[PDB]
């Protein structure tokens, strides 16, 4: 319930760290921006993974583990998309 809101915010934060770093890049280098892409996707994946662990450890029903894990997957994916768009702005 509040777990939706916490994750949606946390994942939005990730794409802002990208939005910032890409914009000063916008303001060796093509190599640099591909590195930042791989890092921020690796941050989204890692956080996804972390949340799934915490979810699977909770004493809740499977249906609930399923709703929560799918909520969290969808945001993580929405973030990979939004960040994939920023690499294209460079490339």
């Amino acid at each position: 319930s509040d777990m939706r809101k916490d994750a949606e915010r946390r994942f939005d934060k990730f794409v802002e760290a990208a939005k910032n770093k890409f914009d000063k890049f916008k303001a060796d280098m093509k190599k640099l921006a591909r590195k930042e892409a791989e890092q921020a996707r690796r941050a989204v994946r890692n956080r996804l993974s972390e949340l799934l662990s915490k979810i699977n450890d909770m004493p809740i029903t499977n249906d609930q583990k399923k709703l929560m894990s799918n909520d969290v997957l969808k945001f993580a994916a929405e973030a990979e998309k939004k960040i994939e768009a920023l690499a294209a702005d460079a490339e």
Partner: antibody
Amino acid sequence: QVTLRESGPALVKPTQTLTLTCTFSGFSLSTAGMSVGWIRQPPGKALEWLADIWWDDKKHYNPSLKDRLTISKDTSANQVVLKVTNMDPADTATYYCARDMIFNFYFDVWGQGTTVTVSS
Amino acid sequence: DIQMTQSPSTLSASVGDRVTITCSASSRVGYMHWYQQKPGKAPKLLIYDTSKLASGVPSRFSGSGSGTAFTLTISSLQPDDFATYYCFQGSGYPFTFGGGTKVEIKR
């Protein structure tokens, strides 16, 4: 291409232990969300879920097989092993492994199954 | 632990008929899944999350329901829909399947 492939003996004597092994590829038990489960089907009867294991190493077993099951994983080898103790003739069945996800809580990909006969 | 009853357990119908299989559960589940199994093959997932279609599954298949009562529908039976169909619940441990329903063809 997600594939699973069950292996083990076709024949087991009554009271002995059966050791089954699932080998898979196209996915990994190191990935968050992933699970492998075992299901069996006696000849001409219904499917019966036996066990599963998750990527965080959490396990579940069917109480109907009360204490005869051990499941375990080898992530690096992409292999899950299932051990069934004190086999009796009613355990004669086709044994299947299949892939499950915390997003699904259902099996979307199965091996072809391996047939086990309990007999002297 | 949740047990499911399928009706009928056996069924014959002609090619082109509408066929319905019901799976009532012993208590509430959030979702029902359906497997199709042909002669000496592994079960293939057919319908998941109650009404959503799996891949390589024609549109003539569909599911509905909620709570304890669910249906699988084949809207125009084909010869290759010959199989045994099982419902399956993953909402609770242990996981369980219905007893099955044999679909046979009349010609």
